[PDB]
């Protein structure tokens, strides 16, 4: 395992100090639910299928922006903003 | 509320297996439950299919989300009575949930 | 088990540490069809070959002995077919 | 309503909004699994010992959920796509197509 990431909302059960270990990417996401209510989350993403998840679908019904990064604890610096 | 492992102790006398199984009295089986949201994090060990299905669900709610199930199970041995009152030891695979994920 | 071989080509063989051209023996799961494919760019009438190789069972390639691109004006052309070395030559349409 | 089995599902990349980075294919038949895992679990149903134990437990403790219908056999498809640098890449994505379903 090479990468450590911050996690919030998406932490595994073996999470320590709100960080997780992965061999893929770190991510951060901002999402707007049924109501104009916004929430931020972050965590670890496996390499397999990460191209799909980091790209996401621009046709998603709810507004959200996920971003990915690949160096140790990098997601603390991702500040995704909702799409217009 | 997201997909994770939950507790589940299976008492053999509660499911009528104690007349067949001499030992153990029961065991910790656990179970998996919870939402598979977008995105599917590393620990959910999801297949590409589950990832694609989650994204389609996000575009069209008519397509269900992936489901939280055991992605890793382990074995347990159990002691049974042979038709001779001979206590026989047998291994049973896939009895215990070791990990949960979205499939 | 049905066997399939395709023409292999990789314009980025260098940065990918692979052969630039040659032959590729395909491997497929049971009862799964086996195909070949070609991809290229056509900028200013000059055809730029990108990649050629094996392609897994895909209905878009079923029973086509020729490799013909099925997209009007893409930025990257693609064709697939079902037959040995059927990606040797390709055309647009 | 119905028993655990495969259902049709065609994933169209234009509808997902990926037709700009995926050169081929235009889409594919992914299928999905859906349906109940009723007690007693039907033999033809592909089921693990755990799903069997869980189903039995659920029959006498409704607080424990039933097993779930999910993909148990999947196959791969080839995709050709453009990376961040507009470079063409080939990848055989594993587990993209549901071949069979089961209660887990």
Residue numbers in the entry:
A (entry chain C): 34 to 117
B (entry chain B): 12 to 114
C (entry chain D): 6 to 98
D (entry chain A): 11 to 114
Can you provide the manuscript's text about this entry?
The crystal structure of the ternary ligand-receptor complex of wildtype BMP-2 shows a dimeric ligand bound to only one BMPR-IAECD and ActR-IIBECD occupying the expected wrist (type I receptor binding site) and knuckle epitopes (type II receptor binding site). Both receptor ectodomains are located on the same half of the dimeric ligand, with the binding sites being almost identical to those identified in the crystal structures of the complexes BMP-2:BMPR-IA and BMP-7:ActR-II. The change in ligand-receptor stoichiometry in the crystal is clearly due to crystal packing as SDS-PAGE and RP-HPLC analyses proved this complex to be hexameric in solution. Inspection of the crystal lattice contacts shows that symmetry-related proteins block the empty epitopes. Inspection of the receptor-ligand interactions of both BMP-2/receptor complexes (comprising BMP-2 L100K/N102D, in the following termed ternary complex (1:2:2), or wildtype BMP-2, in the following termed ternary complex (1:1:1)) demonstrates that the ligand-receptor interfaces are highly similar. Superposition of the complexes yields an r.m.s. deviation of 0.3 Å for the Cα atoms of BMP-2 (in the ternary complex (1:1:1) only "bound" parts of BMP-2 were considered), and 0.4 Å for the Cα of BMP-2 and ActR-IIBECD. Analysis of the contact between ActR-IIBECD and wildtype BMP-2 indeed yields only five intermolecular polar bonds, one ion pair and four H-bonds. The H-bond between BMP-2 Ser88 Oγ and ActR-IIB Leu61 NH is in the center of the otherwise hydrophobic epitope, whereas the other polar bonds reside at the periphery. Comparing the affinities of the ActR-IIB variants L61P and L61A to wildtype BMP-2 shows no difference, indicating that, by contrast, in the wildtype environment the central H-bond does not contribute to the binding free energy. In the structure of the ternary complex (1:1:1) comprising wildtype BMP-2 the temperature factors of the equivalent residues Leu100 and Asn102 are higher than for nearby residues indicating increased flexibility.
Bone morphogenetic proteins (BMPs) and other members of the transforming growth factor-β (TGF-β) superfamily, like the activins, growth and differentiation factors (GDFs) and TGF-βs are secreted signaling proteins that regulate the development, maintenance and regeneration of tissues and organs. Members of the TGF-β superfamily bind two different types of serine/threonine-kinase receptors termed type I and type II receptors. In the present study we analyze the interaction of BMP-2 with its type I receptor BMPR-IA and its type II receptor ActR-IIB. ActR-II and ActR-IIB bind activin A (Act-A) with high affinity in the low nanomolar range leading to activation of the SMAD-2/-3 pathway, whereas binding of BMP-2 occurs with low-affinity in the micromolar range resulting in the activation of the SMAD-1/-5/-8 pathway.
